[PDB]
Design a protein around this nucleic acid. Structure first.
Ligand SMILES: [Mg+2]
Ligand SMILES: [Mg+2]
Ligand SMILES: [Mg+2]
Lengths: 106, 117, 252, 88, 65, 52
RNA sequence: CUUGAGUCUCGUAGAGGGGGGUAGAAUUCCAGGUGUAGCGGUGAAAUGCGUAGAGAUCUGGAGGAAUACCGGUGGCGAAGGCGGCCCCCUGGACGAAGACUGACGCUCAGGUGCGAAAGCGUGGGGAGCAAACAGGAUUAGAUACCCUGGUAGUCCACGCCGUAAACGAUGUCGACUUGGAGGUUGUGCCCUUGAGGCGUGGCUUCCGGAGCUAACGCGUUAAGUCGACCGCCUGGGGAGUAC
């Protein structure tokens, strides 16, 4: 199926529920018989400009190969879940497993 | 009578006029001057000299309110930028941030038609 | 600016005017002596306005003319023709030639005096004259021709080639005469209602009148007047326009 | 514009073997399947004229192939249009 | 040219903010490809990447924001 | 930090930003045909120098 | 029969189209807040706006429109045209290496459909801009040129119109015929790697040989050399006008 990047950011003051979010979405992926090749967090990270008047929000990445359907589910779950302040989904060419440069800097 | 000192200075320069205003850190106006109120009209209203004089009039207004610190920002396309801010160097303040804050749109809405001249 | 040059058409215009006593005649824009002389000649005495005081001196000092006319030196759009109609004993014959930016104003000022004027006789540019007489269903028709045809009956007199003028323009032009109706064939409650109905309509002349006059009236009003709202503004005669004007005025 | 597997089903149906592609039967079949599928596209995407320019190319290409096969062999033509229900 | 061509030949990139910073003004505008020395193929990829990076506030749009 | 050296630094920054040239040219709308014509006119006005 | 035509497998580049989300600038507007005599506009004025607080500047909100920069002598598209970003649907193209069909082809009167800008139709929307209009100025006059306003329109869905210097002013398809400097996008081989260097398609720009051309110029992307079909012209006006 379509490979995807899913990349999103969470309110600094909801960053503690992020493990629960990884559960909810990873369960949607495996419950679609999709697979995952990266999961990452880059912590609270400062913003080049304010998002929703906030700063320092918490950044997350997934590399995924789920069927198209459930991507629209989790996508619309972002408009339902106000703890997610932004998301971007990308129909990337391949599954990719090598860590983000945001991790590899450590 | 109120004495405070933290100061933001806004220069609003155009080919007809230059307004200059002083505000607190909050952005709350302490006082202001223009060129047209400096008294110049028509052509003289938009001159580097009139923009200096406008700055002197603001410098007097802030002597009453606050004078130790200033952070000066500049806007509009008009002449006399250097002339008015060096006129803030008169009764000089300790300032370090300068850029314009001239509004540039990321391909915003239709400007007026060109003059048939 | 222009004034005529050739005796053939000068003589044609002044003769077609038929200027004689038993008429309350007044020139406006006497201009070059050549065309003001024959009318000041045939009328035993004649009134005139010139806008220019220097030309008014040139003609008032001319012994053919100064002794044979009474002469006024001002913008005619200030001028109290309703009192001049009293001083001339009967409503005026007003006539002549001008630089004619003022033309549009002339008509309105003349119409402010439809009682005080017996008739108007003037040269004008080809397109505005053909508009002024235009039949309702034509592109030449429109709001100013509507108001003109409302105030007066309008009649082309004769048409003149551009080489006929002293500075010859590129543009052919015609003398036209018009007649304030002795009783209005179209009685109207007010003319401002006509003026605004016509401007709204002609400001929107490409769309249906449902999308022009139906922006104010309903379709059921329009069809109630017997008017199809699916017409365009340039299908509509002055008759139903004054009917609309009366409807606006009386239902307001 | 078709999945390799729908293509495989079609060529394994209408084709001589797996070595055949582009026998007239293979062509008109996969072309037909594409045309059938695209009815769903245009039923939403009415204004997609630039896409439908390709559809017009495809239906006329189908017609040209059928008419060639019709003059080459009526039996192959009739059993093929029978199988696809063509001249519907 | 050929050294800048090697920068394209090696990699096609998004999320490498450290390399994106090689191709922006301090005011946040994209550098024109002739100044970068890079080939247009990679310029497009860089522009697409920068636009995404701005969307996620990894890079500013302007100097101020 | 001398005021007039910070002024020179500022002047270089606004020059590098081009903002006065942008707000100058942005003053009016244009029928896109004329900037098309002006663009290719400049392109040949340039290319004529390439020849020696 | 396989050389034309065309299918398949694998890649590639792209503002191609259709549909749906979404972002940062920006303007205007509203709501405060600080604040006060001006602002605004022009050549200068005036009309305009402000002591009911404008202008300015801070915050917060609204709404409609458009995508600064990349961006190019650059890509895609039949042409008209296509440019923030992501998704969803979807068209075409080019290269690779085979495999497959087996002349299935080209052109095309009528026909059918797509077709800028303006305008119309039906119902929304209306930020900014702006025919008409309105008012202030300018001018011998000024209808213009200037300014302050401003409706239609500009936007959207769904109909219509069917024209543009809709022009490469250059019909479509096929073959051939010196070179040269670029651009762009695949690809092969060599790479000592990484740069390189031999090739090799596609697209595209500018020079220019021969030849052609009234001349200007065109010139392997012909306006050269030619084959098939289509469209069109037959002095100037009257007139793309009448009927
Ligand atoms: Mg409409
Ligand atoms: Mg339109
Ligand atoms: Mg005709």
């Amino acid at each position: 199926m379509r490979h995807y990047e899913i990349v999103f950011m969470v309110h600094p003051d909801q960053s503690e529920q992020v493990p629960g979010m990884i559960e909810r979405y990873t369960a949607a992926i495996t419950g679609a018989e999709g697979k995952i090749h990266r999961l990452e967090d880059w912590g609270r990270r400062q913003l080049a400009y304010p998002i929703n008047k906030l700063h320092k929000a918490h950044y997350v990445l997934m590399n995924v190969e789920a069927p198209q359907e459930v991507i629209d589910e989790l996508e619309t779950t972002f408009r339902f879940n106000d703890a997610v302040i932004r998301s971007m989904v990308m129909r990337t060419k391949h599954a990719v497993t090598e860590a983000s440069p945001m991790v590899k800097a450590k | 009578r109120k004495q405070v000192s933290d100061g933001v200075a806004h220069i609003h320069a155009s080919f007809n006029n230059t307004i200059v205003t002083i505000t607190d850190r909050q952005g709350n106006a302490l006082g202001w001057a223009t060129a047209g109120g400096s008294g110049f009209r028509g052509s003289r209203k938009s001159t580097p000299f009139a923009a200096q004089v406008a700055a002197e009039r603001c410098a007097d207004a802030v002597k009453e309110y606050g004078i130790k610190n200033l952070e000066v920002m500049v806007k509009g396309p008009g002449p006399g930028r250097e002339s008015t801010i060096r006129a803030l160097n008169a009764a000089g303040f300790r300032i370090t941030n300068i850029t314009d804050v001239t509004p540039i749109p990321h391909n915003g809405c239709r400007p007026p038609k060109k003059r048939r001249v | 600016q222009n004034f005529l040059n050739d005796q053939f058409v000068i003589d044609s215009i002044v003769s077609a005017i038929n200027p004689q006593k038993g008429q309350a005649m007044v020139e406006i824009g006497p201009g070059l002596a050549a065309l003001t002389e024959p009318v000041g000649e045939r009328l035993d005495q004649l009134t005139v306005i010139e806008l220019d005081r220097d030309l008014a001196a040139r003609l008032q000092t001319h012994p053919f003319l100064g002794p044979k006319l009474t002469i006024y030196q001002q913008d005619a759009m200030t001028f109290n023709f309703g009192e001049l109609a009293e001083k001339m004993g009967q409503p005026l014959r007003v006539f002549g030639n001008l630089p004619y930016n003022i033309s549009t104003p002339l008509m309105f000022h003349l119409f402010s005096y439809t009682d005080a004027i017996a008739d108007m006789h003037f040269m004008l540019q080809k397109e505005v004259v053909n508009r002024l007489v235009a039949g309702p269903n034509s592109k030449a028709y429109g709001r100013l021709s509507v108001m003109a045809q409302y105030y007066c009956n309008v009649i082309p007199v004769l048409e003149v080639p551009p080489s006929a003028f002293t500075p010859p323009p590129k543009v052919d032009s015609a003398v036209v005469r018009l007649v304030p109706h002795a009783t209005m064939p179209h009685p109207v409650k007010d003319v401002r209602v006509l003026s605004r109905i016509t401007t709204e309509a002609f400001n929107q002349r490409r769309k249906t009148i449902r999308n022009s006059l139906g922006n104010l009236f309903s379709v059921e009003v329009l069809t109630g007047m017997g008017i199809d709202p699916a017409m365009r503004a340039e299908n509509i005669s002055v008759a139903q326009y004054c009917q609309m004007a009366n409807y606006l005025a009386e239902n307001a | 514009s078709l999945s390799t597997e729908a293509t495989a089903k079609i060529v394994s149906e209408f084709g001589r073997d797996a070595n055949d592609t582009g026998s007239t039967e293979v062509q008109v079949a996969l072309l037909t399947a594409q045309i059938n599928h695209l009815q769903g596209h245009f039923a939403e995407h009415k204004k997609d004229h630039h896409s439908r320019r390709g559809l017009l190319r495809m239906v006329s290409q189908r017609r040209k192939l059928l008419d060639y096969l019709k003059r080459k062999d009526v039996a192959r033509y009739t059993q093929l249009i029978e199988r696809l229900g063509l001249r519907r | 040219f050929c050294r800048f061509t090697a920068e394209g030949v090696q990699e096609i990139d998004y999320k490498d903010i450290a390399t994106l910073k090689n191709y922006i003004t301090e005011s946040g505008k994209i550098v024109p490809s002739r100044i970068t020395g890079t080939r247009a193929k990679y310029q497009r990829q860089l522009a697409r990447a920068i636009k995404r990076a701005r969307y996620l506030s990894l890079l500013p749009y302007t100097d101020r924001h | 930090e001398p005021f007039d050296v910070a002024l020179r630094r500022f002047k270089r920054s606004c020059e590098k930003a081009g903002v006065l040239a942008e707000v100058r040219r942005r003053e009016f709308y244009e029928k896109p045909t004329t900037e098309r014509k002006r663009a290719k006119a400049s392109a040949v006005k340039r290319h004529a120098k390439k020849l020696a």
